[PDB]
Design an enzyme around this catalytic site. Structure first.
Site, PDB file in Angstrom:
ATOM      1  N   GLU A  15       0.795  -1.238   0.000  1.00  0.00           N
ATOM      2  CA  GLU A  15       0.000   0.000   0.000  1.00  0.00           C
ATOM      3  C   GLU A  15       0.822   1.280   0.000  1.00  0.00           C
ATOM      4  O   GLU A  15       0.449   2.254   0.648  1.00  0.00           O
ATOM      5  CB  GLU A  15      -1.062   0.017   1.109  1.00  0.00           C
ATOM      6  CG  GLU A  15      -2.500   0.103   0.605  1.00  0.00           C
ATOM      7  CD  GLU A  15      -3.505   0.168   1.736  1.00  0.00           C
ATOM      8  OE1 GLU A  15      -3.111  -0.072   2.895  1.00  0.00           O
ATOM      9  OE2 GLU A  15      -4.688   0.458   1.464  1.00  0.00           O
ATOM     10  N   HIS A  19      -2.532  -0.726   9.981  1.00  0.00           N
ATOM     11  CA  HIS A  19      -2.304  -2.165  10.149  1.00  0.00           C
ATOM     12  C   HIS A  19      -1.112  -2.442  11.050  1.00  0.00           C
ATOM     13  O   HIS A  19      -0.533  -1.520  11.617  1.00  0.00           O
ATOM     14  CB  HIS A  19      -2.065  -2.831   8.798  1.00  0.00           C
ATOM     15  CG  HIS A  19      -3.312  -3.090   8.016  1.00  0.00           C
ATOM     16  ND1 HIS A  19      -3.891  -4.337   7.937  1.00  0.00           N
ATOM     17  CD2 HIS A  19      -4.086  -2.267   7.268  1.00  0.00           C
ATOM     18  CE1 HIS A  19      -4.969  -4.271   7.176  1.00  0.00           C
ATOM     19  NE2 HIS A  19      -5.110  -3.027   6.760  1.00  0.00           N
TER      20      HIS A  19
HETATM   21 MG    MG Z   1      -5.855  -0.033   3.589  1.00  0.00          MG
END
Ligand code: MG
Ligand code: C14
Ligand code: C14
Ligand code: HP6
Ligand code: HP6
Ligand code: MG
EC number: 3.1.4.12
Lengths: 384, 384
Positions: free
Chosen positions: A47, A270
């Site tokens: 990402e 995350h």
């Molecule tokens: Mg995401």
């Protein structure tokens, strides 16, 4: 002789989305410092949509990691950055055919062009294949319009690993599957490839409760997303397998517990996954495959219905256009027929684009289903 | 012991396009009869867009060929049919990211979703990997807007073969490359993979002058297309290679000379390729790669320019929309501002779609260029 290898693997979803992520530059800086200090053999970032961010990291981590590659596909890019202290012998990428719907802009996964990247590293006379992937996100647990898409992506991922890893001694996959361990897609990938989860097999585990990558404690995570699950969800995985004659064991597995390991604000929404792997020299369940086959068929039926509905809309628009011409020719209204005409044309063009996208979707679903059916048929022949 | 294998390979571009091909049903019938009589080990048909045609052939050729698969991708399908007298152990498909432009409907390649298909056959204890492909067509020899696209497709094809064939003893590729042997794309694929042309290595050749697949004699071929080349063009190829310990030789290679081998009207506008291969047990030129790298860069620059031009159009449309609102608010014109407004909105939407497609194209070109650059860099390190 005796072969011993120690592998330090780092996986983090960086959530580096430009203009949508708080403190993006600061988080990138902290990440670069952490990676340099740790000196992981392989670091598989995810990402990182911004090219500038990749360049920021590549320059910063250059002495420690001489090899770095960014995979680019789709409108906004795959977002996969990989940094390695070891030179990468070969690079290849597979892009999933069915990445979501463009009309669902609120989701936005379609623009990503999600893909799986292969890195081949030869370490101490041992071929290692490393895969980094990011599957389609899940928005509602109760109802999924992307259930079929994710299962197809998992199957394509499983096929890619199976075909390209023939000669690889150690196979490592680190990625954000976006699915629970119980979910069909994870089971389908693991059953076919034969990969083993690091968290399940780790001798020692340090970190967040239950190894959950997404955590309530983390400030960035929305509470509503984690309202159903009290301790959060484990959707990022480190999966590994080895060929005969090679044994791989997961000594230590670690997660950063919702925060920066320096007690700062978390690096990302995350959680970082850190696995230490030691490599020392010295049948797929057809029920899982059949369940996947069934789910794909249901998805195909829905796609066919949408295409049929779109065709009806195109026809209706054409009839309206013909009617408008009649009115203009008669001249009875005497006004605004032209005004109404232009939008009606646009309706037909848009409904046609929607129809074409759905026809393509049916073909994409068929490709995965046909391969699954083939495997199932061969298994039945072996059984009989 | 001693291993001897005889392989009969048939490749034909069927030109089975519904409503655009003369005598399509009749040609399919003749082809089915021919295949049944010949009993080729592997037959790799191409351009069979109609599903019904595939089903017609599959049922007709079922006793002789128990295994048959059709690859489906894109709006109208890949068009690749493969028939095998031997059971296919594994199937996988790779779809090229950059298949042309949708706005160029007169060409129409974009709707095809062209791809490469892999068939794994285990014959007599020997793994065989068979690839069937159809590259983007060339419309003008002098100027190509698809030069960069084809080079990227050739590179992706080369990478796919290289990665998935690690364990295969014999590698066979039969496809319509759409490029001359001298052309860069053919050279790039052959230099990387190591494949060898059957026509060049055949002990005995029977057929059309110079092995040219497209021929002036064939009635279907347009004369204007073949006006530059007197004897026609060779754009369909049978390429083969074998691993150490295995030797493969091309005994007989044959083409059908612009006609049906039964003296009937030709089966297709293209020409059948029939190769007999005998398998018996017992460095890429960086200049070619660098030329490919340069061509891709030129293509990327053009794509970037088009995206920038599109962004300007979107801006102009927005300014026009704002102006129209001002006029309506003032009421000075008092009429038709609404009429003009709707098309102006459409302009912005269409220019946005064009812009997005081009941004995606730049990313696609980058993926191929980056992999080529990586390989070139490693070679330079080895040289120094
Ligand atoms: Mg995401
Ligand atoms: C990832 C694949 C998405 C392609 C969507 C297909 C949409 C078809 C649009 C056709 C536009 C034609 C313009 C003349
Ligand atoms: C093969 C890939 C083709 C995709 C073309 C991209 C076109 C983008 C269209 C976006 C439509 C958005 C609708 C809201
Ligand atoms: C890829 C084009 C899809 C447009 C859908 C509009 C409803
Ligand atoms: C994929 C959409 C492209 C439309 C271009 C219109 C000029
Ligand atoms: Mg043709």
């Amino acid at each position: 002789p005796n072969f011993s290898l120690r592998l330090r693997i780092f996986n983090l979803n960086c959530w580096g989305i430009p203009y949508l992520s708080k403190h993006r530059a600061d988080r990138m800086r902290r990440l670069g410092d952490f990676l340099n200090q740790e000196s992981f053999d392989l670091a598989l970032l995810e990402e990182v949509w911004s090219e500038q961010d990749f360049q920021y990291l590549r320059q910063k981590l250059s002495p420690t990691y001489p090899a770095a590659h960014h995979f680019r596909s789709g409108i906004i890019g795959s977002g996969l950055c990989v940094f390695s202290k070891h030179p990468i012998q070969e690079l290849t990428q597979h892009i999933y055919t069915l990445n979501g719907y463009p009309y669902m802009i609120h989701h936005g996964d379609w623009f990503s062009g999600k893909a799986v990247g292969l890195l081949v590293l030869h370490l101490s006379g041992m071929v290692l294949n490393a895969y980094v992937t990011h599957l389609h996100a899940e928005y509602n647990r109760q109802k999924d319009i992307y259930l079929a898409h994710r299962v197809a992506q998992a199957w394509e991922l499983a096929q890619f690993i199976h075909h390209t890893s023939k000669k690889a001694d150690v196979v490592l996959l680190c990625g954000d599957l976006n699915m629970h361990p119980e979910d069909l897609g994870c089971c389908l990938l693991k059953e076919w490839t034969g990969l083993h989860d690091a968290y399940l097999e780790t001798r020692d585990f340090k970190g967040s409760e239950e190894g959950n990558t997404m955590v309530p404690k983390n400030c960035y995570v929305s509470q509503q997303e984690l309202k159903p699950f009290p301790f959060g969800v484990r959707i990022d995985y480190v999966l590994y397998k080895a060929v005969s004659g090679f044994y791989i064991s997961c000594k230590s597995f670690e997660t950063t517990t919702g925060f920066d390991p320096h007690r700062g604000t978390p690096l990302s929404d995350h959680e970082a996954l850190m696995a230490t792997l030691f490599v020392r020299h010295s049948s797929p369940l057809m029920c899982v495959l059949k369940e996947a086959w069934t789910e794909l068929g249901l998805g195909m039926a829905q796609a066919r219905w949408w295409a049929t509905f779109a065709s009806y809309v195109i026809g209706l628009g054409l009839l309206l256009l013909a009617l408008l011409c009649v009115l203009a020719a008669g001249g009875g209204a005497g006004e605004a027929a032209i005004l109404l005409w232009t939008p009606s044309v646009g309706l037909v063009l848009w409904a046609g684009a929607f129809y074409l996208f759905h026809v393509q979707e049916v073909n994409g679903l068929y490709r995965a289903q046909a391969e699954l059916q083939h495997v199932l048929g061969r298994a039945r022949e072996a059984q009989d």
